[PDB]
Amino acid sequence: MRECISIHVGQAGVQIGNACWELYCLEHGIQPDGQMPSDKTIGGGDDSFNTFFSETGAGKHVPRAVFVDLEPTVIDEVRTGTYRQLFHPEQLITGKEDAANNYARGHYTIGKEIIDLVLDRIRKLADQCTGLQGFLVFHSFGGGTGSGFTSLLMERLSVDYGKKSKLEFSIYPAPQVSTAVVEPYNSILTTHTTLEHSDCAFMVDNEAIYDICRRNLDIERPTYTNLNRLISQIVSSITASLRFDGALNVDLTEFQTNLVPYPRIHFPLATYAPVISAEKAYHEQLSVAEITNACFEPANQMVKCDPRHGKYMACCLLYRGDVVPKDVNAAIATIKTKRSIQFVDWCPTGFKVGINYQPPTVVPGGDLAKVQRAVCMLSNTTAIAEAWARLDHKFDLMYAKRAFVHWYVGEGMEEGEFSEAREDMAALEKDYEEVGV
Amino acid sequence: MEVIELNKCTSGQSFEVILKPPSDPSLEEIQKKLEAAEERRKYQEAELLKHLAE
Amino acid sequence: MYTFVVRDENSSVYAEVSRLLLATGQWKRLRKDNPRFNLMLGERNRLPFGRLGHEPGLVQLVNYYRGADKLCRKASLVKLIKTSPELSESCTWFPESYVIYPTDEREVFLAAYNRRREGREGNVWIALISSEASELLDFIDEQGQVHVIQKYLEKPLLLEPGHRKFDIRSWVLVDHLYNIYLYREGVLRTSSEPYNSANFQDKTCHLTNHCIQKNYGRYEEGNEMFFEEFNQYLMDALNTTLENSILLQIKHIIRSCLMCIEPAISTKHLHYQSFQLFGFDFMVDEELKVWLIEVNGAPACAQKLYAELCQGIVDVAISSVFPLATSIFIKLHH
Amino acid sequence: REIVHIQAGQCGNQIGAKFWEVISDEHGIDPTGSYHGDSDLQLERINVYYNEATGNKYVPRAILVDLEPGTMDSVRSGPFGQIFRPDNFVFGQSGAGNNWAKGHYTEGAELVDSVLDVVRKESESCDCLQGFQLTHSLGGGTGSGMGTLLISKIREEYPDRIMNTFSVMPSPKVSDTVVEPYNATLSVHQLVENTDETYCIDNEALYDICFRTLKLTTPTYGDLNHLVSATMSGVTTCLRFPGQLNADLRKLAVNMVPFPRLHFFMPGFAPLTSRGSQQYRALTVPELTQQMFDSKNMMAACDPRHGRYLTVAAIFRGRMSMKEVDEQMLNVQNKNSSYFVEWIPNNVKTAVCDIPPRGLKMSATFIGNSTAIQELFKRISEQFTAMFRRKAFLHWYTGEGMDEMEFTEAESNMNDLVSEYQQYQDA
């Protein structure tokens, strides 16, 4: 058994972390006080769920996770939340003042006065690991903390944990739920600095999650709660292989192996189905073929784009519930003859499939209905680059006039880093082009 | 068509299906970047307090 | 009050469309780089489809289908027909063609060139037009770009009086629901100089482009015969109609080509929607058998038909999505 | 994140006292300083403006300043006069006689250190001071002269704290003296340099609204302040209450100010109402949106169609369909996209608060960084030049040690500020 440490940075990271670890507890039958009855190895053990939970002699199961935010507001609700007993104080780090939606303020200014503390609190978890795999880092692109401090952290982890992998769960900015006009700056800036320090990053466009919550859950105005409880289901699907018995994606290295042939291009597109409303009176349960066919519908993707006009480098299907290989292969065969699925010439056209007979757990009183079978497709398609194009365009519009640049320069950053980051993004868009067309 | 690497267990099972075959900076440098930016902040604040002194 | 933008100034068709829209007093034109638009009359190259459908509170529409270049490029059209079971190699309305790269399927082309020579039948091809394979391969490598070799229809239908060659242009509109609308008015781009069977060097009676011809304007105005006259000629000279002898095949080829690529370009469940005007070029042999020549993704219209067609586009492609405060199209059902 | 309030001069103290009167009611605080509300939404972020004492007494973190005791005595005998910490009353006796030089160089310099001692005392109590907000006029002597002096000295001692200001602009329509253009031009020169955020509260606008819209035949300073306290309550809403987004004075500056000097905002409000006269009909969301963007609702006498919006922040107060708010706000931008700069994507952000202001079921406050604001400064510049070309009334200033060159510099910098706003109107 090898351990995984989850790091939640900024508001988005923390609040999503709350959604995930809440869901994790329900899936593993762990109670808010950290007690797990089904665990007969009291005080320890090397089970699959121990990848995410360490154990105390008192029989408490605590998340191998750290929460960090340059503002105490959000994490303070974790300290007093329902799962307050779950974490211990040393896991919840808070600053005095936030990065004010400023990458440079979160990275250079305030980042410098707390980075050593965080790494120390992280080192305290790593010391409790027998064989640390790596880290799962949850954050946002738009936030000053989520963008600024994350990149700095990712840089140091590559120094202190050179042999360890590092996966990302990043929130791509969307105007429907924006918190700043300069989020495009923070997004480009953090991507550039983090790119070489990330092995596999799962982007989630809030725009995509927002419309899914409106279209399928009939929520007129999705709250962060509505967005997070849905994202947590996706994260759960991706991390289930690390928390349960299986042979597919059993460790972090296998993510890069199965989804990331080219290092820089490490942004797999996620597609989840089905999303059904809890207060939907009458629902006809969907079949393996129906849910699998929905994995190729752009309306179900974590990022809105068109895989048809791109090329696949890899593709994983992660089922949960009543599913058997026979029905899966039958579904794939049908879909292949109906949809456009082009793989790059230097990759085999196929699908790595993972099934967990336990259907997807739902938060009691949540917005999601229980289903008999669900699926999450992780496809590394060059079509995701449309998101970079969108973002880089918004970046170019503002930077041409050097708007808002003075706020960053005032924090000790150089105006050159803007162009340096944008150039790296220009190279990234090209790498996607060469592979895609 | 071709199903391979079938691995079954109690929790579930996994496999692979093929339809068609194919055809870092150091700690020194980091501390240097953070301190360099801190100097620029100090210089800016000094110019301000010098301007305010006038 | 809807809004739109223009990013293709050279578009004679949509220059008229933008004019008609403003004339309704319910459409407001914006600058090129204004993202807050309902409609986009995009450019021909590097159209940013990636930035469409990401504006909250805006239903966005564009006058182009992403991936439709696979049908509107000669090298792509051949590949599309040969690799698509729906069309297949056995399809009878497309001339025998091959893709050739300069120094690919060159070896395959010569295998068929032998049957024509070792059969003593018609063996003339086109990229220039020649009966010698060596003269053609030497021409492609001397140009630079990728060219397509295609069987030349040595026995074309010839208009009388004149003994003239011609090609038919059909304007098709595909809306956001992928309804295929054939414009009832087509046009014959005719040659004024009589077709010469022996001398292929003279490319003025072999090629029927409106630019090359411009005996221009001897028989009809501007080397353009419309359907009413051509229909009358067929009745008088061949005892048949345009509908029967030709138009059925045209409606079949058009319906076939677009149904083929529908799953690859359809914007049914997308975040943005697409429509597009196409220009199909057809060729008719002496046995009244229609052949597909090529498809134009950015077609121009005939002067007489601009007013009616452009108005038509607004009605079924634009106003259908953005309604305001008998039909000139033939719906090819499927 | 505590905010330290300062109010200087006659105008500054009268709008400042009215401000605390209004929001105290919104937070359920009585003149005694005791809480008597019904919602916990009132106390969740009340620390931003109020200090807490034993027995759960809430004291404004405000500092009252003036060079004459006249106006401050009226405050202390006013409705919520007793709520203010009596030690925060710092005043002189000589006044400033509507002279910028007196407030900035001679009379005010003699009192400024006393004020900064109170500022320091409050600041040291703050868990994490985010900045200061100042209320004052620019046409007078104290609030205009000494106010800008305080700002300069506050920046010196707290250079990494935000400086916000509610600056009342002078107008001949509502004039005390003829030297108001001088005092204003001198003050704007300071505000361009030493503030991150300035709400331009133009008296010309406040008069036109009372006269034209509210049909008040002869408006008073009381009528003008009903509009000010309504605007001040509105813009500070997302600072005082918890919500989807929670605002602070720094995040405010970052997203509203694309360039450091261009930080002069146009406040707006809807529905426009006069004192006493209650309205029975609540406005529909489409009406709140249309009105708040209308020039007739702007607190700065500027035609927004004569310029382009760099950034916009809107706050809707009351119980309403936040979906409908979203649609209407998006409808405005989509209908009039020409008046929003294209080189700042998504420069309009909206927020909603459940608690409405007193006397209204729902309202909408507007904050716009428009290039049309140049019309305001160009107006002051013309009135300035008309006298300065003859050196009229300049002896009041030169008698206090000032030189003509200092006027020429202030004039030049404001004309620059105008041209800068003009630069991005044609981008």
Ligand SMILES: Nc1nc2c(ncn2[C@@H]2O[C@H](COP(=O)(O)OP(=O)(O)OP(=O)(O)O)[C@@H](O)[C@H]2O)c(=O)[nH]1
């Ligand atoms: N899906 C989702 N997105 C969120 C959530 N919270 C914030 N965001 C997004 O995060 C982006 C801004 O980053 P934040 O996380 O809010 O800011 P931060 O990381 O705390 O950094 P600071 O500026 O220092 O506060 C916005 O675009 C939001 O849409 C959340 O709970 N769920």
Ligand SMILES: Nc1ncnc2c1ncn2[C@@H]1O[C@H](COP(=O)(O)OP(=O)(O)CP(=O)(O)O)[C@@H](O)[C@H]1O
């Ligand atoms: N394989 C063939 N057999 C007989 N004629 C052919 C032919 N290929 C091309 N042509 C003749 O080709 C002339 C010019 O080529 P084509 O029509 O494809 O124009 P481009 O100029 O090639 C397309 P367009 O001008 O419509 O944009 C055709 O209009 C017709 O005169």
Ligand SMILES: COc1cc([C@@H]2c3cc4c(cc3[C@@H](O)[C@H]3COC(=O)[C@H]23)OCO4)cc(OC)c1O
């Ligand atoms: C107390 O005053 C307020 C301040 C803010 C600002 C603000 C202003 C913008 C913008 C984004 C943001 C965003 O980054 C906010 C986060 O928190 C803030 O302070 C910020 O785009 C153009 O104009 C917003 C308010 O409501 C909408 C408000 O009422």
Ligand SMILES: Nc1nc2c(ncn2[C@@H]2O[C@H](COP(=O)(O)OP(=O)(O)O)[C@@H](O)[C@H]2O)c(=O)[nH]1
């Ligand atoms: N809105 C408003 N403006 C005022 C008020 N009192 C004075 N003013 C304006 O401020 C200017 C006079 O400045 P004043 O405040 O009297 O100077 P000070 O007291 O010495 O700082 C004039 O242009 C007035 O229009 C007031 O109560 N409300």
Ligand SMILES: [Ca+2]
């Ligand atoms: Ca155990």
Ligand SMILES: [Mg+2]
């Ligand atoms: Mg934050």
Ligand SMILES: [Mg+2]
């Ligand atoms: Mg006065």
